């Protein structure tokens, strides 16, 4: 009756860790893609810029 | 007082010896219990030992 609760809390922590890893990966990848897109936009704007 | 002090000196010497040996025997008893526990634990190790290269529990993707 006590090992049940212990195992429940245990599996909860494990699931927390897995979900954290997955969500962090997703967020990181989205941010990196956005940064790359911004870099390309800046490249085209520098090709279009004018002055001296 | 001098007679009592002589007797007490002898008794205290013997008692110090006995106390040291007793504490060391207690230490040894505890360590032997630990050794028994370890000998029983080593039976649960899988055949071939542990794979110390990888993690025991893989708890997330690696993409």
UniProtKB/TrEMBL annotation, chain A:
Protein's name according to its UniProt entry: Putative myosin heavy chain
Lineage: Eukaryota, Sar, Alveolata, Apicomplexa, Conoidasida
TrEMBL record, chain B:
Record protein name field: Putative membrane protein
Provenance organism: Toxoplasma gondii (strain ATCC 50853 / GT1)
Lineage: Eukaryota, Sar, Alveolata, Apicomplexa, Conoidasida
């Amino acid at each position: 009756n006590a090992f049940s609760s212990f195992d429940a809390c245990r599996t909860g922590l494990l699931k927390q860790q897995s979900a954290a890893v997955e969500n962090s990966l997703v967020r990181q990848n989205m941010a990196d893609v956005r940064a790359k897109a911004l870099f390309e936009r800046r490249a085209v704007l520098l090709d279009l810029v004018e002055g001296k | 007082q001098g007679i009592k002090t002589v007797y007490a000196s002898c008794r205290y010497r013997k008692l110090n010896e006995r106390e040291i040996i007793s504490d060391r025997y207690t230490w040894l008893h505890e360590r032997m219990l630990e050794d028994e526990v370890e000998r029983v634990l080593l039976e649960q190790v899988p055949a071939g030992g542990f794979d110390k290269t990888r993690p025991g529990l893989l708890l997330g993707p690696s993409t």
